[PDB]
Amino acid sequence: SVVKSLNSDQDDVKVNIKCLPTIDPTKLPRHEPILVTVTARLNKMVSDKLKGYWASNDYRKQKEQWQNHLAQLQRGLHLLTDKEYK
Amino acid sequence: SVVKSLNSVNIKCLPTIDPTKLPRHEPILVTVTARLNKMVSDKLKGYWASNDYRKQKEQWQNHLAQLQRGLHLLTDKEYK
Method: cryo-EM
SS3 category, B69: helix
Closest CA to A56 of B40, B41, B52: B52
Interface with chain B: mutation pick from A60, A61, A62, highest number of B CBs within 10 Å: A60
Resolution of the determined structure in angstroms stands at 3.8
Give the burial string for A60-81 (b: 16+ CB within 10 Å, else e): beebeeeeeeeeeeeeeeeeee
Strand locations in chain A (E): none
Name chain A contacts of B52, Cβ cutoff 8 Å.
56
